[PDB]
Amino acid sequence: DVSFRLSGADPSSYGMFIKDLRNALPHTEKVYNIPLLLPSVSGAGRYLLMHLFNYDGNTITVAVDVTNVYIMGYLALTTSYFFNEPAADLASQYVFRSARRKITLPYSGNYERLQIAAGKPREKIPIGLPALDTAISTLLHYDSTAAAGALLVLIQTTAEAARFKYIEQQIQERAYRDEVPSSATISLENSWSGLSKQIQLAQGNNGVFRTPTVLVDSKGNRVQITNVTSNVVTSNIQLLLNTKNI
Numbered sequence: 001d002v003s004f005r006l007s008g009a010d011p012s013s014y015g016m017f018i019k020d021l022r023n024a025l026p027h028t029e030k031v032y033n034i035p036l037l038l039p040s041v042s043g044a045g046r047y048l049l050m051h052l053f054n055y056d057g058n059t060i061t062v063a064v065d066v067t068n069v070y071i072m073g074y075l076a077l078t079t080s081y082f083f084n085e086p087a088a089d090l091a092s093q094y095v096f097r098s099a100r101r102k103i104t105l106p107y108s109g110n111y112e113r114l115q116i117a118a119g120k121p122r123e124k125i126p127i128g129l130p131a132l133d134t135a136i137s138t139l140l141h142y143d144s145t146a147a148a149g150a151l152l153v154l155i156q157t158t159a160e161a162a163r164f165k166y167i168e169q170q171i172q173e174r175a176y177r178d179e180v181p182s183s184a185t186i187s188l189e190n191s192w193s194g195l196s197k198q199i200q201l202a203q204g205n206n207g208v209f210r211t212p213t214v215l216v217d218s219k220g221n222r223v224q225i226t227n228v229t230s231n232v233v234t235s236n237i238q239l240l241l242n243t244k245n246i
């Protein structure tokens with residue numbers, strides 16, 4: 001299991017937690033030097049448990065699917081909360097079984113559905129470590145509308161940071177001050193799948209992408225990624241969703 005305590009957290013400890021998270025994910029092979037995530041895994045070994053502690057010491061345990069890094073649900077004291085979707089439901093059979101009651105949230109865990117329930121797109125929700133602290137706080141006591149917002153912050157300050165060096169860096173800059181995400185961040189978040197597929201399709205194609213991937217950069221200018229020599233591939237992305245899942 002991996003743990004992170006917001007109390008006494010600085011950019012450095014966060015970096016270590018995200019490194020720990022990355023190393024918690026299994027993989028047998030690397031593609032162009034980046035860990036390729038497993039196609040599938042059997043039983044309880046498919047889920048990673050994250051223990052998160054807010055500033056006051058309260059905690060929630062989050063269950064993450066190790067083949068994609070998707071959050072499936074979490075535990076607050078004695079109530080387990082799971083997304084309203086098949087995979088999440090499958091996940092309820094191996095984790096948080098000793099919970100007194102299990103609640104199914106009224107939405108599945110994809111950005112589109114979470115942004116609807118939250119009432120705002122993630123362009124306008126501030127993220128950072130202070131926000132993570134709030135997120136944890138908000139999940140300790142049920143409120144489907146509040147949880148949507150908190151989960152959008154949680155998914156990004158953990159899963160998305162794990163997948164992209166850039167996003168981990170964005171969060172370290174927001175260690176004592178929240179700030180809405182840059183469009184580069186949103187763009188990356190949205191391309192993890194495409195990039196993952198294209199970096200794999202370049203393996204028997206001299207490192208050249210079958211189809212170019214379009215992102216928005218630091219400045220907000222539209223850019224095209226056609227090949228693995230790009231910074232995004234050489235230095236940004238840290239995990240690859242196996243094509244068997246796309």
Ligand SMILES: *[C@@H]1O[C@H](CO)[C@@H](O[C@@H]2O[C@H](CO)[C@@H](O)[C@H](O)[C@H]2NC(C)=O)[C@H](O)[C@H]1NC(C)=O
Pocket residue numbers: 208226227229230231
């Ligand atoms: C692969 O991507 C690189 C960019 O990392 C392309 O780079 C060209 O050369 C410089 C720096 O590498 C770029 O800024 C230029 O805009 C590019 N000029 C060209 C040749 O178009 C490189 O071209 C790409 N190579 C491919 C497509 O195999």
Ligand SMILES: Cn1cnc2nc(N)[nH]c(=O)c21
Pocket residue numbers: 069070071072083088108109110111155159
């Ligand atoms: C990032 N992401 C996209 N779809 C997702 N679905 C779930 N359930 N959890 C996630 O973290 C997620």
